[model samples]
Target: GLASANVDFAFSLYKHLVALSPKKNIFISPVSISMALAMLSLGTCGHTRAQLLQGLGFNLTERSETEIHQGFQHLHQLFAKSDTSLEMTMGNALFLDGSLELLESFSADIKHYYESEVLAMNFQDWATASRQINSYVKNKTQGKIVDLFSGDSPAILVLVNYIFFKGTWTQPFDLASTREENFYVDETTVVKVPMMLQSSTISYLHDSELPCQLVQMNYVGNGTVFFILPDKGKMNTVIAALSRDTINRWSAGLTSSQVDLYIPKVTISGVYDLGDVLEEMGIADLFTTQANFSRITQDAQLKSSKVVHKAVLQLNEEGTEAAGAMFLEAIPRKPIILRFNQPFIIMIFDHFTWSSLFLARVMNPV
Candidate 1:
C-alpha cells in the first residue's frame, strides 16, 4: 500500500506554523488534498504504485483492482472541490487544484476588484526544488522566514493580498516621550531606533525567566500590534526564549490591563517567501528531480514541476486582513493565540472529512 507517512508529516508542520503566528488569525485547510493530488500526479501504473495510491486516497473498497483504478479520476474530482477560500493567504494553499493560469486569473481579478490594494504575488516552486525555493524566498524576504515548504513532495504554493493603512496614535508621542532608545542587537553594539512611548493603560505580560515584557496593542477591531521589550540585560535570553508555544500562550492569555505602552509607530512593507520553511517542515522529497509521484498522473518519471509561495503583510491603524495563497498546481488554522514566544505550529483540517491538509511552523521572525 502507498505510505501515508508524508501525509502525517504535513499535519505536524501545520501545527508548528499556527503556534508561531500569534497576532495573525491563522486559518487553513487539510493536507489530504495535497496528498491526493500527489498520488494522481504520480500516476499509479504499476501494482506497487496502485496500492500506494489507494492507501493514501483512503479507498479501502473491496472492489476489483481495475475498478479502483477507474475510480481515482471520479473520486479526485469530488475531493478537489474540498479546497476553498481561506481568511489568511496561507490558508488557501491547503488544496492544490488550480492551474497557474487559473491562479493568475484569480490574482488579476482580485487586483481589479480591490483597486490595486493587493500588494504581493508569492508564486514559486518549493515542494520540489527545496534549495531553489529556500534561496529565492530567503533573498526575497531578506531571511524573515526560511522554511515554507515541507514533506517529500510538499508541492506547496502561495499568494498574498493585503493593504496597509497607517495612522498616528490619538495622542501622538511628543518629542519628549520619544527617545533615542538603545536597542541592543547583541552584546557588542546598541543601535538607537526612535522608540515611541506613552503612559496609558495597555495590555501586557511579564515573563520572569527572560525578564521581558510583552505589550499588546489593538487596532480598529481584532487586529493587533505586539511589542516585545526585554530587560536591558535579558535581551539575549528573551530572543533565545522566543518560540511558537511561548507566543501562543502569551496571545491567548492577553487581557486589557492598565499600564504604560511604549512602541514605535512604523510601517513595514515587504513580501515573505516561505519555500524553505516548507522544505524544513518535511516536504524535502518533492525537491528531488527524481521524485516518484506516480499516483498523480500515470507518468512514472513525472516529478513535481514547482512549488511557490509569496506573501505581503501590512500592520496599520485601521485593522488587518492578510491573504496568502500557495500555488502547488497539484498539491497543497485559527487561533486563540494564548502567546507564542517559542517555536510553535498549526494545522488546517478539512471541515467535512476532518483530514489534515496543510501544516506550518514559525520558529523565528522572517
Candidate 2:
C-alpha cells in the first residue's frame, strides 16, 4: 500500500513539474523527497503533519498515522535486502545550529524511524559549515551529487536527503553497436547522440489504450527501469493519464519479444527546491508562521525555508558501467526495432520494496 501511494505521489509531482517547466528536462528522486517530508512530519503537529502525508497520496482516514510511519520504516529496510550487483545507498541528515535544541522525544523518534543522522554546527562560520555538509553528502552519494549548496549559507538548519544507485544491465550493449544517431527533439529540432543498441527478448507492451509503448529493462539485481515512450505530440496526454493502475495494467500486458532496442547514452541531472512545489501540493502551512513544529523545539518559532532535492542518472553501454563482458547476441526472430529517438519517460524501481527510486523525463538527450 505504501509503495503504491508513493507511486501515485510521484506521478502527481511529475505532472506538476512538467506543467511548471514544460520545456525543461525533468528528473527527481521520488522516494528521497517523500521520505524526507515523511520524516519531517514526525516532528510536526496539527494540519501541517496531516497535509504532508495526504500530499504524499496517503488516505489518512483509511490508515492510522502509526501504520504509515511503520510502513516507511519497513520499506526502508526492504531496500537493503538486495543483490551484490546493485549498489544503492540512501542517507538523511540534519545539520543544525550549535545553539539550537530539539525535543528529546522528537530527536529519538527521528533517529529510530528514519535512521537519520544528526549533527550540530556553527551557522556563523558559513564556509566551514558548507564544506562539512557538502563533504558529508559527497561521501553518501559517491560524489555523484555535489555543491548542493555552494558558496556560503549561514542558516539555522539544513536538512538533506540523497539516494545513490548503480545497477548494471542484465545484458550489456555491445560497444561496437553504439553509433551516432539523430534524436528528434521535436518536429523541427534534431540532435546527434550515441545510441546504444542491443538485441534481446525483452518484456514489452504496446499500450492499446494510450499512445505509448512500455518496455521493461532488467538490471543485474532485482531492479527494473520501466521505459515509456509516448507517441509524437502525446507526452502531455501520457503524463496526465499516468496512475498506479495504469502502470500496473501496462506491466501486466507485457509480453516477451525479440527487440532491437536503441537507447541514447545519457547522463542527466535534476535540481529542485521542493518547498515551493510542496506548498502547491497543500503543504503550505510548513512555510508560514502558522507552521507547528513545536515538537521539534519550543524556544524558537521555526519554519522550513527550502527543501532541495538533487538527482542524477547515467545510462551508458554498460547500463551502469563496471560490469564484465556479457555483451549482446544476435536475435534469431525478425526483431522489432524499438528506437528511443524522441523524448520519453523513465521510472527506476527497486523490486524488493517496489519503491520508485527515480523518475525522469528526457526532453533532450544531450
Q: What is the lDDT of residue 122 in candidate 1?
A: 28
Clash-forming residue pairs, model 2 = none
Per-model TM-score, in order, reads 0.41, 0.93
Stretches of candidate 1 off by over 4 Å are 1-183, 186-194, 232-257, 269-276, 290-366
Candidate 1 residue lDDT tens string, 1-366 = 222333343444344444344434233333333432332323323543444434333344544444433443332333333122222211121222234233353344333322222222223443445544444444433353345454444333322111111212333334576554554334554445555555655666666555766665543321234456555545345545544456557767666665544443222222222334445554444445555444333312344445443333332232332222234433420112222233323332223333333332322322
The worst-scoring run of ten residues by lDDT in candidate 2 lies at 323-332
TM-score of 1: 0.41
* Top-TM-score structure, candidate number: 2
Following a full C-alpha superposition, what root-mean-square deviation does model 1 have from the true structure? 12.5
Per-residue lDDT, model 1, residue 7, is 39
